[PDB]
Amino acid sequence: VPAFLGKLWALVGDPGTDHLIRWSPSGTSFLVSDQSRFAKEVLPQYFKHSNMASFVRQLNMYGFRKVVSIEDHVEFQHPSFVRGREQLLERVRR
Amino acid sequence: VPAFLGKLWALVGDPGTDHLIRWSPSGTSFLVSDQSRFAKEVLPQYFKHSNMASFVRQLNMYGFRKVVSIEDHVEFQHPSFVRGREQLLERVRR
Ligand code: NA
Ligand code: NA
Ligand code: NA
Ligand code: NA
């Protein structure tokens, strides 16, 4: 598992960050509650930078997608990024 | 499980419909490859109507969301609608 994805996995699951970034109730997507605060408060802890645009670009390079209503916060998803599915994470690729 | 969701579960998983509606590779979302054809060819088989707008409205009433790129076909998702997770399906509610 690439270091970016190992860090992403850890930071999403970390209870200490859940007020800003956490798994959905079933773990098939993850929620960033406040993008500005996430970039200033969580990203330095895990990546030693605070650049949301770089982070989102990296998610895009790995094929992550956004979850939106059929009809600031953001919800991301990847078929192979699922809480508890440690071996499936190996399928997330650039 | 409400009849709409039982039918949805069956039709997504049905190999005979997979050219038009199928689970994603990990089963955490589902893809409609061609909405017009899906409405004319799959919906009558399972619901005895051909109205895409009614179907999508029903998905919205149950809290389904759409999956889109970070930067016709459509991909839908619900935290509690996951291939193989039969008991989790009980949590999908109006
Ligand atoms: Na967690
Ligand atoms: Na977290
Ligand atoms: Na299937
Ligand atoms: Na199918």
Side-chain angles (χ1 to χ4, degrees):
Chain A
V1 177
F4 175 79
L5 293 174
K7 291 175 173 194
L8 182 65
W9 182 264
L11 69 91
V12 170
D14 183 350
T17 67
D18 277 352
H19 59 297
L20 289 170
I21 185 169
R22 63 178 184 268
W23 290 111
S24 80
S26 67
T28 66
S29 63
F30 67 94
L31 174 63
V32 176
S33 65
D34 183 324
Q35 293 183 74
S36 304
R37 285 187 63 201
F38 165 80
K40 291 189 180 70
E41 303 172 30
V42 178
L43 290 181
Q45 293 182 222
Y46 279 85
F47 300 104
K48 281 165 204 299
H49 71 80
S50 61
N51 198 295
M52 191 59 173
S54 306
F55 175 77
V56 174
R57 187 169 320 120
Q58 200 72 213
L59 292 179
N60 189 55
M61 295 200 301
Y62 281 101
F64 285 76
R65 287 158 67 72
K66 300 210 305 223
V67 185
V68 302
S69 71
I70 284 175
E71 331 188 71
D72 209 24
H73 61 284
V74 60
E75 181 182 357
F76 292 111
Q77 182 270 358
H78 189 293
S80 298
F81 190 82
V82 177
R83 188 179 63 224
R85 298 198 187 175
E86 289 178 352
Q87 296 181 100
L88 180 59
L89 181 64
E90 298 168 16
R91 301 188 185 260
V92 183
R93 291 299 135 188
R94 285 275 216 95
Chain B
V1 177
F4 175 79
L5 293 174
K7 291 175 173 194
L8 182 65
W9 182 264
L11 69 91
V12 170
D14 183 350
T17 67
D18 277 352
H19 59 297
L20 289 170
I21 185 169
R22 63 178 184 268
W23 290 111
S24 80
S26 67
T28 66
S29 63
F30 67 94
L31 174 63
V32 176
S33 65
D34 183 324
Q35 293 183 74
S36 304
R37 285 187 63 201
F38 165 80
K40 291 189 180 70
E41 303 172 30
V42 178
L43 290 181
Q45 293 182 222
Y46 279 85
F47 300 104
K48 281 165 204 299
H49 71 80
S50 61
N51 198 295
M52 191 59 173
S54 306
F55 175 77
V56 174
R57 187 169 320 120
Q58 200 72 213
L59 292 179
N60 189 55
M61 295 200 301
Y62 281 101
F64 285 76
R65 287 158 67 72
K66 300 210 305 223
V67 185
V68 302
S69 71
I70 284 175
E71 331 188 71
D72 209 24
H73 61 284
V74 60
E75 181 182 357
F76 292 111
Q77 182 270 358
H78 189 293
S80 298
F81 190 82
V82 177
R83 188 179 63 224
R85 298 198 187 175
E86 289 178 352
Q87 296 181 100
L88 180 59
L89 181 64
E90 298 168 16
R91 301 188 185 260
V92 183
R93 291 299 135 188
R94 285 275 216 95

